[PDB]
């Protein structure tokens, strides 16, 4: 299938084992901003669901399919590849919805549905939006979408902005500096210090922060899920030009995302911005191994390049320069091994 | 190989990726009790090393091989299957020991050594001693051991004791009772509550505790690494009869372990007992889903059965009874998915 061809079996097994736990479904359901905003998007756009056919891509416990049923959907196909599919079926029976929600075990790339659908719903967003490569399964599912069918969420906006955080930078350097020791119990570790620095600075930092660390207005990159094809997400090139509002050391770029559910009645936004209430996605920071000085009024420009790998994640390349001085930082990050600093 | 036949590829890939990070090698090296006790065991038994041939099974960064070199070993074969082997080779060159330490990339079950060795050194202990199934690779390596060669560690003792901890027990039902809601955003979750309770109680609890929670003197199960075969670890049956020193509710069994390095000059012990300073192994507790009342002077008897699985861990079965009342509890746990409560 398209899933098995893009994914190492090793990563798939670990991935679906992780989402098979009730504890993990619970952790996600308990994010009230997430769960409540999804419910509001669906119920306030009830005409997008009333008497319609729905596909729920990666239904987990089934929660979004239940929201679609509350809104009046005639039929909901709820596709789930983990062992969570069994638990979903139990809930569908106990809530007396066997006439309306049909659980289909397996990958959305591999199952068959009996008809085309009016609307696809999913929660495909990972850290930095793109982690887990679930957006590809979501877009793949458009093969089941009727012409003029909708998608919930409809669009996704990635936001980036430069930040200053000397304490964060020093924490990572202090950890890597372990490998500087010429006599760790009599052993010289120092030939590995560069490799250690590289490894620590490859880790995106998942945590929240005060907005005052941000040194310019964010730049926005938009993915339209109605129009994008799966293959568009193999290589994601995000150019940026920041106009610096404060003078200081730029220690890296901070990332967050918003999704919009563009319904017939209204548009509802789920935001993971640092100006908004906290979610279990937090925000994500990519540190530069050498920070860059910029004065207010300068321009920081470059590219964030995300390259999809077979471990259901991305190799990230970030190149940034201060245009007025030619000072450059080039960084590689490994989105599969984040540092959960919260 | 013997490794591939006993291990799902999915688990092996995750396992060796994890040990490929310098951060993880560092976390283990920074455990002073571990690193210092290994150094002391090797250096204070310098006659077991001076001019001898040594095999280091799963050398990681190479630290134990360097200790063998400090003690005078003539030749050390350092086997490592993760990408950490490359980092070890860099350290061997930078410490001018290429004439004495030979790094061999790969699994100890698949590589070739050019000669037999006098002594095998390793750190094969996981949570509850047996987690990760690395003891099997350690014993497998005895095919390279000269007759009357030594093993460092020489023996391993698993200790188990009944404990009382009402707050730990209650935390499981508090977490699972999330599912005992008739209208979580309009959805009746209650039919999954039993399954959630079962999942939480299947997790061994990795943390430490005050010794006052223990209700009887521990029972000891010993593996002699000079005599044991790999096959001995596929099924580990630990019978127990505890003579209760305190009255109360028994909520489960607590586990820890000791290893001894039995050298020609002295015996050195590395202990993870709750009476000793804390290590990164902590201790491990397996809860009973139904606790058992026992009075001081009663006998709590039964069996702990550890059954090796292909995810490099064990299925644990614990059956216990209070002999004076016939009250019974039977419990199943999955050592691959522990709860890190510290
Ligand atoms: N917090 C962080 N870090 N990230 C955010 C979590 C992102 C959503 C989690 N969950 C959403 C449940 C929403 N109700 C994804 C589910 O989608 C299933 N699934 C994944 N892929 C496929 C596929 N190709 N086919 C069929 N099912 C698939 C998984 O098994 C899993 O249950
Ligand atoms: N903290 C917690 N929780 N546990 C502690 C766990 C203790 C082990 C740490 N480390 C020892 C560090 C250096 N003394 C094990 C190494 O042995 C490698 N390795 C495993 N198996 C094999 C094999 N079959 N062949 C070849 N190499 C193998 C691993 O890649 C890993 O580097």
Numbering used by the authors:
A (entry chain C), B (entry chain A): 135 to 476
Q: Which passages does the manuscript contain on this structure?
A:
Protein arginine methyltransferases (PRMTs, E.C. 2.1.1.125) catalyse the transfer of methyl groups from S-adenosylmethionine (SAM) to arginine residues of target proteins, giving a pattern of nitrogen methylations dictated by enzyme type. Co-activator associated arginine methyltransferase (CARM1, or PRMT4) targets substrates that contain proline-rich sequences rather, than the GGRGG sequences favoured by PRMT1. Co-activation of gene transcription is effected by methylation of histone arginines: H4R3 by PRMT1; or H3R17 and H3R26 by CARM1, for example. Novel non-peptidic bisubstrate inhibitors and crystal structures of their complexes with CARM1 are reported here.
Putative bisubstrate inhibitors 4, 5 and 6 containing amines and arginine-mimicking alkylguanidinium groups with chain lengths increasing from three to five methylenes respectively were assessed for their potential to bind and inhibit CARM1 and PRMT1. Comparison of IC50 values for inhibitors 4–6 revealed a modest decrease in potency (2.3 to 17.7 µM) against CARM1135–479 as the length of the alkyl linker between the aminoadenosine and guanidinium groups is increased from 3 to 5 methylene units. The resultant Kd values showed a similar pattern to the IC50 values, with all inhibitors binding with low micromolar affinity to both PRMT1 and CARM1 and again, CARM1 displayed a slight preference for a shorter alkyl linker length. The catalytic core of CARM1 was crystallised in the presence of amine-guanidine inhibitors 4, 5, 6 and 7, and the structures solved by molecular replacement. Electron density corresponding to each of these respective inhibitors was clearly observed in the active site. The alkylguanidinium group also extends into the arginine binding channel as designed, confirming the bisubstrate nature of inhibition. In comparison with the position of H3 Arg-17 (the arginine targeted for CARM1 methylation), the guanidinium groups of all inhibitors reach beyond Glu-257 (which forms a bidentate interaction with the substrate arginine η nitrogens) and Glu-266 (that forms a hydrogen bond to the ε nitrogen of substrate arginines). The B factors of the guanidinium groups of 4, 5 and 6 and 7 are relatively high compared with the other ligand atoms, which may suggest that this group retains some flexibility when bound in the active site. Unexpectedly, the length of a methylene linker between the guanidinium and azo adenosylmethionine moieties that comprise a subset of these inhibitors was not a determining factor for PRMT1 and CARM1 affinity, nor the position of the guanidinium group within the active site of CARM1. Nonetheless, the high potency achieved with these shorter linker lengths, in combination with the inhibition and crystallographic data reported herein, suggest that the 3 to 5 methylene alkylguanidines in our inhibitors could be shortened to a methylguanidine group to better align the inhibitor guanidine for interaction with CARM1's active site glutamates, thus improving binding.
